[PDB]
Write a protein that binds this DNA or RNA. Sequence first.
RNA 1: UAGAUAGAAAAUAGGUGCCCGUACCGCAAACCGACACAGGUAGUCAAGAUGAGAAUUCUAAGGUGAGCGAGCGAACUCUCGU
RNA 2: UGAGUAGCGAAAGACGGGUGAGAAUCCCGUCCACCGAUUGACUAAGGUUUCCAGAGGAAGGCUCGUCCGCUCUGGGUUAGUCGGGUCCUAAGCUGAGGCCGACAGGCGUAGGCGAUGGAUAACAGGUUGAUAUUCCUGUACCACCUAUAAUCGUUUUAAUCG
RNA 3: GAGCUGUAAGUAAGCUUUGAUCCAGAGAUUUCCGAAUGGGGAAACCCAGCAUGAGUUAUGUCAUGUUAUCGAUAUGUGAAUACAUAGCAUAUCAGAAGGCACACCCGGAGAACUGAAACAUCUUAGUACCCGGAGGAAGAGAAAGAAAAUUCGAUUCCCUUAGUAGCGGCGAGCGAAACGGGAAGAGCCCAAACCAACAAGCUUGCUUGUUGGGGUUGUAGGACACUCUAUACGGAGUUACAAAGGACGACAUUAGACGAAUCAUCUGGAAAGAUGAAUCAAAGAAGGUAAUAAUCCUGUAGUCGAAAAUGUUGUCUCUCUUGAGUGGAUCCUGAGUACGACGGAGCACGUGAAAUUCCGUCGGAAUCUGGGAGGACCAUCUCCUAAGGCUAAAUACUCUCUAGUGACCGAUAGUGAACCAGUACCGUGAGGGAAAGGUGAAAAGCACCCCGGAAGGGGAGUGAAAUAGAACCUGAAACCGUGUGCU
Lengths: 65, 102, 61, 89
Amino acid sequence: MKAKEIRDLTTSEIEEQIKSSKEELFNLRFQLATGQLEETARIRTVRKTIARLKTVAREREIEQS
Amino acid sequence: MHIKKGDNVKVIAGKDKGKEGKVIATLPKKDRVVVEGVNIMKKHQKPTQLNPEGGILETEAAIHVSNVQLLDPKTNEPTRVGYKFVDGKKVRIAKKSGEEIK
Amino acid sequence: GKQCFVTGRKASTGNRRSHALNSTKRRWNANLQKVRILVDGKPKKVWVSARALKSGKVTRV
Amino acid sequence: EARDILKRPVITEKSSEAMAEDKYTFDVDTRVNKTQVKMAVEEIFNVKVASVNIMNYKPKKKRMGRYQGYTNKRRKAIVTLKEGSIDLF
RNA sequence: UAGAUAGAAAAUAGGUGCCCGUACCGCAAACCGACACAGGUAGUCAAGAUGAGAAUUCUAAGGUGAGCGAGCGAACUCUCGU
RNA sequence: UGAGUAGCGAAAGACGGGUGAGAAUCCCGUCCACCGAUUGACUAAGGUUUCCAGAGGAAGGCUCGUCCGCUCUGGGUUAGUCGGGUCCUAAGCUGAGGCCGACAGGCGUAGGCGAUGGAUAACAGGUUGAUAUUCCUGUACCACCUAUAAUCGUUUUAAUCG
RNA sequence: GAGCUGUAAGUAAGCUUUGAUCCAGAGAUUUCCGAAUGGGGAAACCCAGCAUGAGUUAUGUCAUGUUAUCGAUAUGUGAAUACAUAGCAUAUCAGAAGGCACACCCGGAGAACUGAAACAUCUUAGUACCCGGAGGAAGAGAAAGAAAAUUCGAUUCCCUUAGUAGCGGCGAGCGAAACGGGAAGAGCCCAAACCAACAAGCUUGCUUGUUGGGGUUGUAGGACACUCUAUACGGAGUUACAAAGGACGACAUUAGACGAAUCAUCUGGAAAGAUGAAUCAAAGAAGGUAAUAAUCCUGUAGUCGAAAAUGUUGUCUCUCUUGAGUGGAUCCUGAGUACGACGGAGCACGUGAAAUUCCGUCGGAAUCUGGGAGGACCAUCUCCUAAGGCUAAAUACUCUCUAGUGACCGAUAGUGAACCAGUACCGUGAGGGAAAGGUGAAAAGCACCCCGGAAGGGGAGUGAAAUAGAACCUGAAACCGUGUGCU
Ligand SMILES: [Mg+2]
Ligand SMILES: [Mg+2]
Ligand SMILES: [Mg+2]
Ligand SMILES: [Mg+2]
Ligand SMILES: [Mg+2]
Ligand SMILES: [Mg+2]
Ligand SMILES: [Mg+2]
Ligand SMILES: [Mg+2]
Ligand SMILES: [Mg+2]
Ligand SMILES: [Mg+2]
Ligand SMILES: [Mg+2]
Ligand SMILES: [Mg+2]
Ligand SMILES: [Mg+2]
Ligand SMILES: [Mg+2]
Ligand SMILES: [Mg+2]
Ligand SMILES: [Mg+2]
Ligand SMILES: [Mg+2]
Ligand SMILES: [Mg+2]
Ligand SMILES: [Mg+2]
Ligand SMILES: [Mg+2]
Ligand SMILES: [Mg+2]
Ligand SMILES: [Mg+2]
Ligand SMILES: [Mg+2]
Ligand SMILES: [Mg+2]
Ligand SMILES: [Mg+2]
Ligand SMILES: [Mg+2]
Ligand SMILES: [Mg+2]
Ligand SMILES: [Mg+2]
Ligand SMILES: [Mg+2]
Ligand SMILES: [Mg+2]
Ligand SMILES: [Mg+2]
Ligand SMILES: [Mg+2]
Ligand SMILES: [Mg+2]
Ligand SMILES: [Mg+2]
């Protein structure tokens, strides 16, 4: 998910998205450990999505001040 | 590079000097290009690899980009390339005919 | 780190000289004396040189 | 933070025997304690944890060509379930 | 005791209890000696016969046959017996 | 070059059967021999993966090598009670202010740190290739928390804490 | 503007013209140790308080913030001891700390080997080392100067004076300065007299103190008195001369864009070489490309370009601000100072006839009819006006960045280090400290067969070459072998 869609989202929605993305990343890591993950690029995709969500949240709590 | 994937080029230096072909790959970091039917190498392929059948495989090896020259769209002669700006977009121009290449 | 509280008068270095002009390092110390004077409006025992004390220019209290 | 406390499951012969005994082995963040591991497991897998054993593994010397180095240090926990089960697959 | 404050709990039941070390060598081929080195390395346990004994000789529990061998059976050198 | 010379670092091996391209040298067996106040069993330092399993034989191993403390691959160390910390202090170290000293800094009070000593609650059995007072079985103990409490107290108190 | 997920090949999974990767400006995130600062500690670890919050029935557990010391400024409290002074407690602070560029600067402290053909004065040398303090430069600086004429007019730096004058067990050696020629230039502010306001002593005399004004010097200046001049007209300014800003513009730096002109044959694996015939040039710098290229590529000359940040500047704005003359009655013009003695030091100058200048100790002036200097000292003359402060430039240096250069090196050289080097290795530690570059144009890096367990090899094939097959360009010598003509 890109920064434009994230900026469309609301702050509570960003927090919920961060939670769900973290759960997805964790499940991917567990599948990788057990040898059940073929689509390894998903891990990096989700990690960068989490980074973008946090970046936008930080931008908002900065512009608030 | 001034040569681009898909261009029709003439070889101006090498064993294949005078051959024409299509640019099917470029290597910007090596200043190299791959041209169909040009620079054929015979590589020893082990049948024991992931491909069962093996032997001597013939394929194009990359050539240095300064050894191929664009062919003029009108005259079909080798030509250098300039650049124009049409409505704020860069256009490749053959320096012999002045026509847009692509 | 010993000097006159009032003037900063402090020790210096130089040579002791023999009759044959051999040289050895020595110091000239100030003639400091521990006196009670008024520092920031309160009595305080500080080191003051005799020369700074001369002619009652410093108040001992 | 539970998903950060637990890093991955450990799948070995000894770990499989433990799993037969209802003990599940995980590599965990090197900074966490036994209690944090228990709470993370209960939060993530909706089980009841009977106990947690924990241990540290030193960096291990490892070689590749002419380059000498070390593997990461590890913190390994063994979580004994009271109620429920965990399916790693 | 000075102080403190309405509350205190014999028992019963239930529950909570972190971090570090934990492998292996450790009179040694893994420690200190450049060595798979006749050296050095604190402490604990330490059976039977003999005996005053933890000495002596032979054994137990347990461990070990020593990281070049095969012949020959000269001088000479070493270690040993007469 | 010396020269295929000196050396191969305290010692008792023999044979049979395996394995292997190859065996005095690896594995298994029998007999024999050596230590046994110990060459046995623990364990503190120190080392730091050397431990275990499978594979290998260039180099290392004073020979050989099918083997290894070597090489490759994958594993292995589980604690309220064991040792240390969340307790104590010794020598010593450090040290707010302080004293002293060209600078740097030295000394030192209160206070801290600091085991080689003080305090301090878990034992037996079983189990793996590799951990076990740590895992498992049985049976305990210590501190704390929550609920219910025989009973006692209820503002000079008098139960309770200290 | 078409590929991309580094070295770094591979496989896998993916991304990218709905513009990836990549390049530049700005921003976000930025674990732990480290001055390291909640406390402790054998750095990268351990153990807490407090507040708020998460979780649990509750304890246990967790999250975030905060809690060092000293300093300064406030507030409260306040001992011996009455008054209040130690002290104590709280709050605020982009206050300090620590690092380093093995350079340059200023200062504290300060050797020795060495030279003197020995050695002590002397030299090495105020050097090395240590320590403190900086700054982008520092230091110095607007005459108590240099001099001796037609005088000059702050300081610093270069040339010269000059190896002169001098110093010196008059040994070894040490060694100026003024003048003259140059770089660069810039001048200012206080203290005091006096005035006004405020406060204490309460003569409630007018003394003291604070604030503001005034004032700044040798042609003596100022106060003071008087006369003109102006309330920013003018002038000045954040580089001193007082100190903060704002608007707009220009230029520059940090990515980039365009950018002329060659074909053929011969040799060859390959042409840029040779041959022939052309072309551009404000571009014939350079690198690359299968051998040696102005015209193949990257570029070069030339021209263009910035969303954003930064820097330097200009104009407005802003801010600040009176400027001259006359008079000589009184007043002011830097005190434990100048200076002296003794002991040291510094001056090129070693105590000397020793001026000039600093330190310790002790003594200790004058007040414009004054004071200092002109190398002891006195007189005269001449030049200055100490005992307060500030100040750009010309000068020094280079860890660093950008663009370049070399009758500098070319792998035992050049850095110790062309390479995963301050590494490996050595040492308890400080510390010492290596060796080691080259396949090929392209990886086309030897399919397949054969002997062998493997290693290794013989073919076959790739390649111009394998006799370039992996520390793989060339491949000398020592040294080691096989064969042999003569012996
Ligand atoms: Mg443990
Ligand atoms: Mg253990
Ligand atoms: Mg053990
Ligand atoms: Mg002993
Ligand atoms: Mg004996
Ligand atoms: Mg022989
Ligand atoms: Mg001999
Ligand atoms: Mg012999
Ligand atoms: Mg022999
Ligand atoms: Mg032996
Ligand atoms: Mg082993
Ligand atoms: Mg061998
Ligand atoms: Mg102190
Ligand atoms: Mg102890
Ligand atoms: Mg064991
Ligand atoms: Mg701390
Ligand atoms: Mg001499
Ligand atoms: Mg001499
Ligand atoms: Mg200055
Ligand atoms: Mg003489
Ligand atoms: Mg004059
Ligand atoms: Mg100013
Ligand atoms: Mg171009
Ligand atoms: Mg061009
Ligand atoms: Mg040609
Ligand atoms: Mg004197
Ligand atoms: Mg004089
Ligand atoms: Mg004088
Ligand atoms: Mg004279
Ligand atoms: Mg300057
Ligand atoms: Mg060479
Ligand atoms: Mg070198
Ligand atoms: Mg070198
Ligand atoms: Mg070669």
